[PDB]
């Protein structure tokens, strides 16, 4: 009730950090001036999800939804089903569970139902090939997101099963001071309720941009039809730059809208992947908050993570301010001894048993 935050900004992160620290928080002035004030249905749904995986939490929401008081319970997990409202795809709900699942008393075995993709949230492939390899590097040996059904917007009808068999005391201490070498480019181009030609056209677009590179480019054609493909036509593509030596990855993702050109989507996502690589060091911008939190919660030891100057953006700044408010931990940044790049080393003392 006393560590106080303003607005809807970083709502899931703030609740996740309170859950991991065991510290009670208050989130006030959520969309205060708006015609429709307070929490959105998807934020309320996320709070119900937090209640289902924890035990003994107290969640109080003010009448108009502008204030949330969160007194966290212990992470318990177990088997459950979560119905995701249309306003957000499954990935919006799966993503914060990734920060909690390995630190649970019992294994998380959650069936998420609804839309499986959007333009703004983590897609299925982003979780499986982007976030999960990062958690594996941190010691989450067994984690899986099983795709039972895809559900393209607007009608959805998708189904994903999150299973995190690895229960660990805390993430291992991070030591990555080099720029990982990209050995190949992989990815998944998928579609629902449409002809196999659309997936082939996205792959054509991505290959047009990527053919200039000196590495292998192998994009999976994943065509979904019939009942398991959900209720709406749709298509998307996730491209993943792989680093075989240690198992690091860089990715970009997007979905196409009705009337859009699949070749153009392929090209765009390939352009976005190259841009993401240019802005990265140890991880990409989309994996950096997870990596940062995992180091904050490690044992009392110093972890090191190489970051690119392009990654120190306003989002990175707010993330660090939220962590300090909850854990009192500061991230120390020192330049690399090299002249080839302007990268820096993020050094973080893990919380351990510290209160």
């Amino acid at each position: 009730k006393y560590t106080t935050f303003q607005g809807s900004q970083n709502f899931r992160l703030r609740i996740v950090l309170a859950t991991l620290s065991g510290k009670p928080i208050k989130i006030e002035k959520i969309r205060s001036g708006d015609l429709n004030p307070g929490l959105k249905d998807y934020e309320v749904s996320f709070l119900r999800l937090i209640e289902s995986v924890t035990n003994g939490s107290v969640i109080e929401i003010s009448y108009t939804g502008t204030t949330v008081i969160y007194r966290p319970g212990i992470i318990v997990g177990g088997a459950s089903t979560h119905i995701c409202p249309s306003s957000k795809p499954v990935g919006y709900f799966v993503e914060p569970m990734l920060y909690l699942a390995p630190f649970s008393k019992k294994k998380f075995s959650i069936l998420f139902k609804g839309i499986t993709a959007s333009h703004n949230d983590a897609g299925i492939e982003a979780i499986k090939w982007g976030l999960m390899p990062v958690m594996e590097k941190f010691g989450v040996r067994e984690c899986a997101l099983h795709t039972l059904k895809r559900g393209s917007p607007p009608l959805g009808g998708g189904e994903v099963h999150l299973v995190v068999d690895s229960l660990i005391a805390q993430p291992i201490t991070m030591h990555e001071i080099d720029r990982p070498i990209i050995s190949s480019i992989t990815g998944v181009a998928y579609s629902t309720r449409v002809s196999p030609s659309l997936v082939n056209r996205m792959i054509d677009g991505a290959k047009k941009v990527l053919k200039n590179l000196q590495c292998e480019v192998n994009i999976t054609a994943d065509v979904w039809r019939g009942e398991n493909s959900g209720k709406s036509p749709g298509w998307g593509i996730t491209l993943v730059a792989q680093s075989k030596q240690k198992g690091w990855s860089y990715f970009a993702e997007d979905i196409g809208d009705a009337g859009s050109i699949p070749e153009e989507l392929g090209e765009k996502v390939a352009c976005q992947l190259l841009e993401e690589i240019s802005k990265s060091a140890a991880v990409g911008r989309n994996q950096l908050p997870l990596a940062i939190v995992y180091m904050v919660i490690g044992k009392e030891d110093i972890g090191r993570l190489r970051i690119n100057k392009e990654q120190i953006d306003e989002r990175f700044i707010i993330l660090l301010r939220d962590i300090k408010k909850i854990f009192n931990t500061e991230v120390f940044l020192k330049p690399v001894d090299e002249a080839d790049n302007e990268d820096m080393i993020a050094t973080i003392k893990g919380i351990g048993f510290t209160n």
Binding site: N212, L213, E276, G284, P289, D313, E314, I317, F332
Partner: protein, 54 residues
């Protein structure tokens, strides 16, 4: 003009930290990108990242 220090100075906004250092919600997982037009032009040549590959 030290970024590590600027980040932990609450009297300064995140956008002001970046301006002073050189030269906006985690609820949106997908990071910011410049327009497709700007990126397609920049990425016609893959030279700026050749060192990241084997």
């Amino acid at each position: 003009w030290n970024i590590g220090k600027l980040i932990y100075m609450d009297n300064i906004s995140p956008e002001e930290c970046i301006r002073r250092w050189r030269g906006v919600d985690l609820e949106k997982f997908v990071p910011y990108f410049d327009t497709f037009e700007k990126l397609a032009k920049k990425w016609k040549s893959v030279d700026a990242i050749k060192e990241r590959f084997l």
